[PDB]
Design a protein around this ligand. Structure first.
Ligand SMILES: C[C@H]1CC[C@@H](NCc2ccc3c(c2)OCO3)C1
Ligand SMILES: [Cl-]
Ligand SMILES: [Cl-]
Ligand SMILES: [Cl-]
Ligand SMILES: [Cl-]
Ligand SMILES: [Mn+2]
Length: 340
């Protein structure tokens, strides 16, 4: 039967089922005030699917100049065409190759650039902004979004949204690499999965994805969404409460020192955006510092709500297109205030 919601992460994560239900705020605001992330499923059913295909981005924008990132080693591929990324999104035989002759796992950096999404793609902008869940929080002028209402004593978010496009990580060695490294944002965010590309050429890549979810600490109900309903899984997230950020900085200062890094005692390993917490580091955070997080598998059409101040990392299972909007809820405005 249709239901309003369910629970993931053994009851620690709210999952809302109807993205446009006018009563969602009643269930949402209790979890949100406690500093929890929230998942909302089904947003893809609200969107115009033809506006979110990799072949359309390549056809319309393919002659623009861009930089890419090699996810395996963080090398920058400078001043190539955006079609060189999009044409290898699902077809592995078309990807740019490293020296070793393997196809690369690539991220498209800062595209559309800065605040230009709305000017470059007005039809995409309308389709996303009219279908975001919890619209009193997430719309530019919603009643519970303080972004446009705050003085300069507060850090305000850039005009959005921002697009996040990257290939899926493939090998057993790739299990320890991030698509986006561990970082935090001083604003709240909603991140929507608008497209998942499961490739062909090295297609049959199914079983390394199951060992990644399992070792990723995903709950038993999340493992049912794969085997039972055959939904498309895009990305594995780990999110930590804002109150645990300093304990995570202490762990990463100790590990950087063990690995022979020579850092001052106050340097900030989260702001540096240089770490991905693999299975070894996640277990050390739990055992040695007492910190538990949320392991979240984002499927096609899932919207992840990330609280201001919460450290988070992202690992693409398959090729993903994500679109995110920043906002300033009243529950978390202390995180962007400039005076301590
Ligand atoms: C705009 C910047 C000025 C200081 C920074 N805010 C630090 C902060 C405040 C409150 C917290 C917290 C961290 O962790 C839990 O509660 C943001
Ligand atoms: Cl908080
Ligand atoms: Cl458009
Ligand atoms: Cl709302
Ligand atoms: Cl990163
Ligand atoms: Mn982020």
């Amino acid at each position: 039967s249709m239901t309003s919601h369910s629970w993931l992460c053994d009851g620690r994560l709210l999952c809302l089922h109807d993205p446009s239900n006018k009563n969602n705020w009643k269930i949402f605001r209790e979890c949100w005030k406690q500093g929890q992330p929230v998942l909302v499923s089904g947003v893809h059913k609200k969107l115009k699917s033809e506006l979110w295909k990799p072949e359309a981005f390549s056809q319309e924008f393919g002659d623009q100049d861009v930089d890419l990132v090699n996810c395996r080693n963080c090398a920058i591929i400078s001043d190539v065409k955006v079609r060189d990324f999009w044409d290898g999104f699902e077809i592995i035989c078309k990807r740019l190759r490293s020296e070793d002759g393997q196809p690369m796992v690539l991220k498209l950096k800062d595209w559309p650039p800065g605040e230009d999404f709305r000017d470059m793609m007005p039809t995409r902008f309308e389709d996303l902004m009219e279908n975001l869940p919890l619209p009193e929080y997430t719309k530019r002028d919603g009643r519970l979004n303080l972004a446009s209402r705050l003085p300069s004593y507060f850090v305000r978010p850039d005009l959005g949204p921002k697009m996040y496009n990257a290939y899926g990580l493939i090998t057993a060695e790739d299990r320890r690499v991030g698509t986006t490294n561990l970082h935090l944002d001083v604003s709240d965010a909603v991140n929507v999965m608008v497209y998942v590309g499961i490739p062909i050429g090295e297609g049959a890549h199914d079983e390394e994805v199951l060992k990644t979810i399992d070792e990723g600490d995903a709950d038993e109900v999340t493992k049912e969404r794969i085997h039972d309903h055959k939904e498309k899984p895009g990305a594995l997230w780990h999110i930590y409460a804002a109150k645990d950020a300093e304990k995570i900085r202490e762990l990463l200062r100790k590990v950087g020192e063990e690995q022979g890094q020579e850092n001052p005692p106050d340097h900030d390993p989260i702001h540096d955006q240089s770490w991905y917490l693999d299975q070894t580091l996640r277990k050390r955070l739990y055992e040695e510092y007492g910190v538990q997080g949320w392991a979240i598998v984002q499927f096609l059409g899932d919207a992840v709500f990330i609280p201001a101040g919460a450290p988070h990392q992202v690992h693409n299972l398959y090729s993903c297109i994500k679109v995110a909007e920043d906002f300033v809820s009243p529950e978390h405005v202390k995180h962007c205030f400039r005076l301590t």
